[PDB]
Nucleic acid binder design. Sequence first.
DNA 1: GCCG
DNA 2: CAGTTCG
DNA 3: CGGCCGATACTG
Length: 326
Amino acid sequence: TNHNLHITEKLEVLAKAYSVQGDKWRALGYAKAINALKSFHKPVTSYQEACSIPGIGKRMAEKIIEILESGHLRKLDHISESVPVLELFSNIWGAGTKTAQMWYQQGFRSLEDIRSQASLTTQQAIGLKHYSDFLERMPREEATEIEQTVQKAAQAFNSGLLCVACGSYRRGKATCGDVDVLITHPDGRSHRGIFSRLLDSLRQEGFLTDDLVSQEENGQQQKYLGVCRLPGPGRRHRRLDIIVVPYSEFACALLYFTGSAHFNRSMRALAKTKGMSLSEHALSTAVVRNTHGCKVGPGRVLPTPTEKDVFRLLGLPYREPAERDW
DNA sequence: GCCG
DNA sequence: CAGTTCG
DNA sequence: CGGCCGATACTG
Ligand code: NA
Ligand code: NA
Ligand code: NA
């Protein structure tokens, strides 16, 4: 489908540069310009042919031009030398742009430096320990094995439990960055305080290797982010994210967890324009917001039994998971 | 960065 | 709280 | 001018 990879290749480099340096809004700007150019059909050929495209402005158009003319972007040759390092550091799970910039300011330039001299949080030490594994995707077939593993351990103590793999898996991708397992129960209450049992069952069989986010000393735990590894030879550590939700929030939870991320954001931005609000918990109407668009009035939750209801309530035609990459 |  | 993370 | 998703859910 990519009819502009010549340009949406030089821009991505610029986009990730801005992202790692912390200029998040400018990076979001570039992401959309790129997220669009790709979705095009014909290779842009005119400054006017560019502007006409949503997500592209005069500034972006100009840069697009210099490429379809200079085959290069002068900007890319003035990118700070720190960027590759910031990117290297930022790819450690648990370390964001603030930690990357700090480490760099402190003279660190490689993972070696980070390993031997950086002060690491428990999450970052886990992230560094599986640095290569966290950058690899897995065949969807393996994701299936992981979901099945969790579902089996979950239904083992309550067969009523509904378990579904979401994210890229549900969107039908060939490979998955991690496994997103959503768990809920049709009765509306049996899903309470199950984490304790599930996580222990999984730890028992040595399936879980590391925990990244798991507030277990509190019975109100909603999510778990960790590392698991199927048994046998040739197996790599994989990221596992599990959320347990009340049946009444099932649809919204499923929509959220299925993504994509940019899809969720667009849909939520849409809800806001209609005086509504969408979250992994619910779709609300009559929401009261202030001048800066901040939620200052809860409004009321709308009945959303299925994903279709959410789309319907927002005045949108339904979309199968596979059609939600953006 | 884009857009209203 | 600031940072980072999930989709 | 100023928002860009969510009153993310955790961590320390
Ligand atoms: Na990171
Ligand atoms: Na995922
Ligand atoms: Na914990």
